[PDB]
Amino acid sequence: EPPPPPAPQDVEMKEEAATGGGSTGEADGKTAAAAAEHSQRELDTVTLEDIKEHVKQLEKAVSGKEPRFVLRALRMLPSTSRRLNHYVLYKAVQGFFTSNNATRDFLLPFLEEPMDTEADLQFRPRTGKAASTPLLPEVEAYLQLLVVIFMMNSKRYKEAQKISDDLMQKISTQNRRALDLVAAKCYYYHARVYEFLDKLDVVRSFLHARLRTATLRHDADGQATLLNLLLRNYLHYSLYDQAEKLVSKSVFPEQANNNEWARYLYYTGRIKAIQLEYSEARRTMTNALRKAPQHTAVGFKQTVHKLLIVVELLLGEIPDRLQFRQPSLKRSLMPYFLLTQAVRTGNLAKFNQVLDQFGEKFQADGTYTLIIRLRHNVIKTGVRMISLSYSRISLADIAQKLQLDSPEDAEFIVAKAIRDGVIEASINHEKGYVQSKEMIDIYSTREPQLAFHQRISFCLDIHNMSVKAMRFP
Amino acid sequence: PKNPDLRIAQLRFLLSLPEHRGDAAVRDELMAAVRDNNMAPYYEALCKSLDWQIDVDLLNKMKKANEDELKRLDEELEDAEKNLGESEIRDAMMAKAEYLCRIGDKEGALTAFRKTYDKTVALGHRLDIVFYLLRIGLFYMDNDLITRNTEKAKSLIEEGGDWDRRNRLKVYQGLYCVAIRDFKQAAELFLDTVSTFTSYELMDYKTFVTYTVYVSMIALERPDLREKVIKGAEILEVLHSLPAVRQYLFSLYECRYSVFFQSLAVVEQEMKKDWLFAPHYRYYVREMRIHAYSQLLESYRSLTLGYMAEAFGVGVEFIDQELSRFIAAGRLHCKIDKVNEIVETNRPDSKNWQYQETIKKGDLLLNRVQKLSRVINM
Amino acid sequence: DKKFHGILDQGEGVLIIFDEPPVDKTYEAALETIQNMSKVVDSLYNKAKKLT
């Protein structure tokens, strides 16, 4: 049972009541490209659908909403709201009437039923909602055997909602953007249907073709959602496509949801990890790290931090990372507490014991370019620590105290250190003197008053962001 | 109760540092186990220390004393349920039931904590409770209950005003602070050394004078250092008893080189034997020597580690990696050198180093409101 | 131990005593901004509370 009937009857009609009944006020709110006040609310409740009960998580009687609502998908004279109220009163097919299950068997002619019924009077969120919400809340069944093509077929009628989206209603619909919100989400379900066993070969030239119909003319959030797809498939898939960005780099005019812009800067900064652009990556991956604070308590912020701080370890120096300790992280040993301990020590045997010992988890790293200059980061951490400590140091001290076997090898490390501008050392190449020294003029004569155009350029930028922020009401 | 079984938790700290022996376990494990119906001081160190061969004539006569004590609980609360007084059950049974927490396990949570906490309005009985989460934070060496007695305490910190016992809240909050690396609040909260003369939760008040001088010797800048530990009038007697403690302040204030380490050797020999300080005898004493090199290395500029190493003892290479880990430790900015050997100090943070933290905050916290500033539209 | 800003110079002679004590510009400003960040924290619960 008696507790399974009342709950989806309540929350389900609370969903489409505000969804259809409010989106009616949205598209009848003739200029609503930014309101969408039950579109984004509805997607907030669909992210709540994947947590909670679905359309019908086969809820112990028959799973009867699917043979209920998509039948008579017709928005005529407003007694069709009473057709949906008949679809409230018929929710006791599980309780009162003859229980008839039609999931995975009649769901394909049910997908034909928005075409089998009469004309959709320009409220496509209900119909593309009926093209996503049946089978994408059935991804949680996880068999993915002959229903890959079923969920894909629901996305084919979503592609019919692309035909009726950007191939119909040629006068300024502005539900096209909300269908780019829903369409982008079920493109992540193209990942969650295709990418379990194949790659999205349709959405290669249809990635760029949905980008083509979402380039300039009515583009909003399709740019960097299709570029999150473009950026995310093409990392496990082979690279140089991020160089295919580089001739046509177009980022948002205005930033989206801070989760999306956060993870987007995490994706492209994670490209600059393997591109080894160390200057921009620390601040855009710092920005991306701090910009996504909401996560599930078992992780994905430790995934974002773990796969974030590797090239930050490869900067040559690093701070001691973040500032908010996590114990399930400590159980999973994701970002290598012991290895960054081997970084701030000048150790090599326990260092390569971490390297050799944990290689099954270095598989979970997948970024083996870390070690090839990270052993070099051990030796540059050593010469940076000792050179930073001593005013003068010599090759007799460091060249065999750090067992570099010879003067000239340390003269090559200091050749690369002066080449990196790390030390202001000098080497007398006659007797074997590193006649190292420390430079002068640390005072605020010139350098901070030069820096104040960066500090105050930053400050005037936040002035103008505050002004443009004031421009909205 | 407080001080005998509190001292038996100090004997659990005697179980703590000598681990290789089981004789100083069993001697006053037995001597603490035979007195005053103490089931728990051989129960948790039955679980932790050496076991018992038998306990029939040894200690089951004391579970028989727990049976006599328990059957006169079964006299007392039934004699107190007839009476209608100040909740005679929970008072006349809060006494012997806090004593039950002295006998056995943490059942004095239910038969102490809420037992008078649900009854009283004065902070005396609940403050005895707070003192008992303190002492069970000395038995188990808690992290929880020595915060939860501050949690129950702040319900009655909002009203009060008292001389001894609320300054004892300042004391044991001090011990909670300096139980981990939190240092100045213990010293400042101990600094009213007058009002804490003798209550039945104290150890030696002279040892309280030692503990406030150990936590008060740093976090006290040199005018305040001489103003407290030297210019203090009434402190001069209770450090005049222990001369090496009096010598320790006078050796540090003399600013020599070797008596830093003779004196520091004395304070090392103390700073093993102190409970909830024996996890913390590294950073305290490098805090000592970073205070010493801080106060000693600032004034000279024609400084050389030859002239240092002459009067330290030997510091030719013996302070080399020491001061290299000190400059390399992030603090103590001077310039250690090759055999040219000139140590060069830094700014007093009048001009240059001050010009950082404004943008350290105006990037970070202002960037947090840059993100919340970007929570307008989506 | 004591001081009169008599900083050690082995090779000058004057053992130069000098200072610039009034720099209360950055003193009072930094002391304000430390409190200002606490005021912005005092606004953060209003900000994060009023939205969602």
């Binding site: 901070p448 008053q449 104040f452 500090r455 105050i456 400050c459 005037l460 936040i462 002035h463 505050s466 002004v467 922020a469 004031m470 909205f472 009401p473 | 010009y355 404004t358 943008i359 105006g362 202002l366 409101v369 919340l372 500033s373 307008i376 | 510009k25 950055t26 400003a29 304000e32 901004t33 200002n36 005021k39 912005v40 606004s43 209003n46 900000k47 009023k50 939205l51």
Partner: peptide, 30 residues
Amino acid sequence: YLASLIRSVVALHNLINNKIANRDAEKKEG
């Protein structure tokens, strides 16, 4: 120095009431 410190505090002037009155007028419009 006065431009650096003081104009950073000018940012600290505009930002607070600009954000607070901004989202008051934004999400209290309806």
